[PDB]
Design a protein around this ligand. Structure first.
Ligand SMILES: NC(=O)C1=CN([C@@H]2O[C@H](COP(=O)(O)OP(=O)(O)OC[C@H]3O[C@@H](n4cnc5c(N)ncnc54)[C@H](O)[C@@H]3O)[C@@H](O)[C@H]2O)C=CC1
Ligand SMILES: NC(=O)C1=CN([C@@H]2O[C@H](COP(=O)(O)OP(=O)(O)OC[C@H]3O[C@@H](n4cnc5c(N)ncnc54)[C@H](O)[C@@H]3O)[C@@H](O)[C@H]2O)C=CC1
Ligand SMILES: NC(=O)C1=CN([C@@H]2O[C@H](COP(=O)(O)OP(=O)(O)OC[C@H]3O[C@@H](n4cnc5c(N)ncnc54)[C@H](O)[C@@H]3O)[C@@H](O)[C@H]2O)C=CC1
Ligand SMILES: NC(=O)C1=CN([C@@H]2O[C@H](COP(=O)(O)OP(=O)(O)OC[C@H]3O[C@@H](n4cnc5c(N)ncnc54)[C@H](O)[C@@H]3O)[C@@H](O)[C@H]2O)C=CC1
Ligand SMILES: O=C([O-])CC(=O)C(=O)O
Ligand SMILES: O=C([O-])CC(=O)C(=O)O
Lengths: 331, 331, 331, 331
């Protein structure tokens, strides 16, 4: 004579299996920005949260659960034990140390490799068929580490890479031209960070090449100093870190953009971090951002951008640098 | 001979006035959760942020701007000067002062009052026709303060009140009954906080009154202790604060839900705080939560809930309490 | 040498297995309204359309495909062969004869039964684990037919039932009370059509019983004639058909609302048609609308509404009528 | 003691002026596709419908209104009298004449001019500050007619033009290359119809010029017959009309995309029809599609695409053709 049984006649016993489950590992500033953006876009029917800080983890789960009335994601769970992540379609890794003022992303590598040695084997134990989307920095090296530790085929291990760098670039381009970032096109490839490569030849509005219109585009002799736009992209994370201490909102939206292509099988092209040995002249097994076709099987194809020999030389050097960092990691 | 002029032929001298602008005052955790929720629901054509901490304010603005590609809000602005808020349709106040240094809370409430003495006159000078939505705690007193300082008619000064408390209640009801919060209906009215009034008579699923089905509902004599659920709602913000240090996500989602009713003129009913002198037996200038019809002119109507004499007595006690605190403030 | 291969390096060959596929059978007025509503709510990663009219089917598929840029459903497929429907999560049946002006949904029965004799065995052959959502009229009898022909457990065979009748009722109530339909609650149960049952006791705003406030609600002696609102609901399909020839938009939105609860596992309560024997006093195998909990396994629970002796008598006579038709059908 | 007055205490006399109103003129298949697309994107707080067929018009309004529960547009109105359209921000014209047996093509165009001679003065009388968006065919000529009759500045009169042709082109490109239409870029300019101009130089994926990679792109001898893709675009409407009798869904989505840029002030670039005299080598008052920056003041800027002499020559011949049809017309 419980109220529930007076009210509700049960017709079916429910061994609930999740169908569109996403996990976020690390519920820091980045992790929670990814979680709220994914929740507000209705990409998942179950969201699992993992962290090592147990009280913070339960507090973040509860705060999200209290907003359930306003969401269309019926189940949010969390735990330190990765059993809560079982049968995820997509596992997003945002755990780790972050930059202080003046610190390069590459200075984070030793701390975050050691964290990944713990995280990745636990992920693959409960979700052996998931896609891994790596956001923790340095993202290109850590996508390689996730790949090696997981044993996954390379199509299922993705780094957020330069998706956000390109979005920042398009925003800054739009502010200068007086149009929305959506209508500005421009690709930043290579390392997410100081050594990223702007592809000046591809920048356009409505298929009109900016460089064809303004041949000094991207050079030091440019009176409008468009080269500084890329410098603002490179510097932007450092400037936000100095002002507010960290970055979170933009990366959350960028990660949810990637999750949407994966979860809906959109086969959109994004500049994300993938194993590009054998492409673009690279001979080592390094992860760099190039335009990739992203869908329900991860990265299925890569677009072959025509680079100048200078643009190609920048990528070739990055690959050497990153491969040099990778070579001496113990995992 | 600039690139913009090579690319773009300007046909129209642009004198921009925003049509659907929202301002958030305070870029703490609550203010930024409101802003991200509003941005992801496409409620505004311009978002303005204001705070007194200039560096954090610029950093939060830039972080949102870098996500523009992923949004459909084309203009995000910020500044210490309220000229950036001009012509807002809706202004959301989340600013407040921190209150734990061996200090009386009567002095604290007074410090938040002094904060509002600066904010509200600046808001009304640049947006004299806006709706004001007060989220800062203690929300019922500060909604009153905003109303007195602004000189706005009462339909245009709204407190977030018990909107989130009711949502938390519906979530917990649904966890107990095995259905989504959307399908559990239940109203927490009165003072936001420890003395809020759960309206047991109205709680229902599918129009079925739970109290008619379970006449013990809301008493201590209930073997199932549904009264404890209201206690859980009252305690939830404290529990989240103890675990993660503050709350943000649920309040942000709840505020964006109120903003949606306002901006789209939906005339949905929400439990929010309104000046209820002359209603529900109240004779003083106090704000408490009742079900209100919310649209483009703010609160246009109040639903008259049939309360028990006990429930009505709770509301009148709160009203006496609030009026006693307010009388010893200064404007 | 081909352009595609100069442009794109393929990194893996994968066979497409859809994860969130929906099929619509019948691409007439109702089917296409369902299709556009589902596409604009992003509920599917693949939409399959089936009809017997081959030119119309290809024309509707092509017209949706040309709008791909504006959608986030990457694959729209169609054909007369049910192989295109393989592995659907949800199959929506909108095929069959409709009401000519004045005619009861009941004279359609045998013609639409004959159609289901071909559709349903083809559906279950290619999607043995799907949920079936029957919209074709008379919907309560045809949901029974689909259940008998399919051999599916009753939780996976759903009729659109009174979801739309209740939505129409809430709209009309809101018009009279000056509030959005979202905030008006009221349940129409039983037969979709002339013999549906309004549950006056459950009608409410903000948990305030209208009947408690207005005792003649639902009686002939009511000076406001609220009973005429239920007659407007019963008559609405007839009035729209007389004006424009058929109805489509409202049913499409109602079906997409049901599809959303299923695909996202929301466990929302909807008034839909389910096999009711053993509940509400019914003795025979009939389908009628009661509040059902709807999720990824279909209908898992039923809300037990407390009915008046008169309301219960109406349901029992409907059950008798329906069983009277079913007894006479031939598959 | 009416029920409404028992239930609701009115606080405010409603001088309701709509803030985000859209009107659709013509409720045939195209007009209703525009309406449902606009409603499901939450672009308007009021939708007004107008037609000359009073019965069909009332039936379509009622059918949309019955779906209010599932929408977030609180007011849908309709009528033969243009008073229902007052204070629209945007008026979409989809009305047109039905061709006759043995009716010269020019006599038909004159019958659409005669229609516009009635519609446009009524629109501008009740919404003198609106934007006009013309969809009726032949769209370049009728946008000119609307501009002349309205007396509006050219920034406020927009033709749907080649927006949908370019979307069809991108869909077809994407089918051939294996990526989403979103990631394929390509512009069809000029006259909507058989003489539109595909801008081969601008076609790209990820900023990679297909013409640079495949320099015979767009020629007759191209073993990949990419020229045939344009021919498919110009023919696609006729193919769909032959199969299903009319086209509606893609144009509806296309129009709602334009309405979104206007209503949200996005300043996105779209290929739409604008009064181009003085640009692209054109000397007469004609409307042609070029990439335009679209926002709350209509078309504020035009992108200057670098065309080949051949493409440029095609545009000028269209302008000559159109100007010759117009000077014939009686206003
Ligand atoms: N790819 C990109 O564009 C960007 C990446 N990041 C990076 O994301 C990472 C996190 O940044 P924030 O969220 O700001 O830091 P945070 O300090 O707010 O949170 C980091 C979380 O990682 C958790 N964590 C640490 N070890 C863990 C473990 N073994 N297992 C599970 N969780 C663990 C921590 O408990 C903490 O809650 C950093 O590497 C940051 O550099 C930050 C912004 C943009
Ligand atoms: N009503 C509700 O349901 C809840 C309301 N809150 C309240 O919201 C308020 C803010 O909470 P948090 O964002 O976590 O605090 P916080 O400390 O993170 O940020 C508060 C912001 O207010 C700013 N501020 C102080 N003086 C200002 C002034 N003159 N002008 C403009 N800004 C000023 C501060 O610079 C700070 O950025 C608090 O009063 C909190 O109790 C907390 C969550 C839910
Ligand atoms: N449950 C509700 O509230 C509502 C239900 N309806 C019903 O929906 C059903 C469809 O109505 P409309 O779309 O207006 O009719 P319609 O005539 O426009 O389309 C019916 C489609 O069914 C197709 N069809 C016939 N046999 C088929 C078969 N073996 N396999 C596949 N497709 C087949 C037809 O070729 C046609 O395209 C009717 O029974 C109608 O009464 C009408 C509106 C509301
Ligand atoms: N520009 C584009 O890309 C596309 C535009 N169209 C065109 O849109 C227009 C409508 O096409 P459909 O909806 O399929 O035609 P339809 O025949 O279904 O509807 C035309 C509507 O206009 C109404 N109408 C006639 N005179 C009127 C007047 N003085 N005032 C108000 N309404 C009036 C009619 O009563 C009718 O309801 C046509 O010109 C069509 O060729 C269709 C294909 C794509
Ligand atoms: O973690 C950071 O803030 C640095 C970074 O990758 C970014 O925001 O671009
Ligand atoms: O007390 C606080 O700071 C938070 C609060 O009002 C809530 O989340 O209910």
């Amino acid at each position: 004579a419980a109220l529930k049984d007076q009210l509700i006649h049960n017709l079916l016993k429910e061994e609930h299996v999740p169908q569109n489950k996403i996990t976020v590992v690390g519920v820091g500033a980045v992790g929670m920005a990814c979680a709220i953006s994914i929740l507000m876009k209705d990409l998942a029917d179950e969201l699992a949260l993992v962290d090592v800080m147990e009280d913070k983890l339960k507090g973040e789960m509860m705060d999200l659960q209290h907003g359930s009335l306003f969401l269309r994601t019926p189940k949010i769970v969390s735990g330190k034990d990765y059993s809560v992540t079982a049968n995820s379609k997509l596992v997003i890794i945002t755990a780790g140390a972050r930059q202080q003022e003046g610190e390069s992303r590459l200075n984070l590598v030793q701390r975050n490799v050691n964290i990944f040695k713990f995280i990745i084997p636990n992920v693959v134990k409960y979700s052996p068929h998931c896609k891994l989307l790596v956001v923790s920095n340095p993202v290109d090296i850590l996508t390689y580490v996730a790949w090696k530790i997981s044993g996954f085929p390379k199509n299922r291990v993705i780094g957020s890479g330069c998706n956000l760098d390109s979005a920042r670039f398009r925003y800054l381009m739009g502010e200068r031209l007086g149009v929305h970032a959506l209508s500005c096109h421009g690709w930043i490839l290579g390392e997410h960070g100081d050594s990223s490569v702007p592809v000046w030849s591809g920048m356009n509005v409505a298929g009109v090449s900016l460089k064809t219109l303004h041949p000094e585009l991207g050079t030091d002799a440019d009176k409008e100093q468009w080269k500084q736009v890329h410098k603002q992209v490179v510097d932007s994370a450092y400037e936000v870190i100095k002002l507010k201490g960290y970055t979170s909102w933009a990366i959350g939206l960028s990660v949810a953009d990637l999750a949407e292509s994966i979860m809906k099988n959109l086969r959109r092209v994004h500049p994300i971090s993938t194993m590009l040995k054998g492409l673009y002249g690279i001979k080592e097994d390094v992860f760099l951002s190039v335009p990739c076709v992203l869908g329900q099987n991860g990265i299925s194809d890569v677009v072959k951008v025509t680079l100048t020999s200078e643009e190609e030389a920048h990528l070739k050097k990055s690959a050497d640098t990153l491969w040099g960092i990778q070579k001496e990691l113990q995992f």
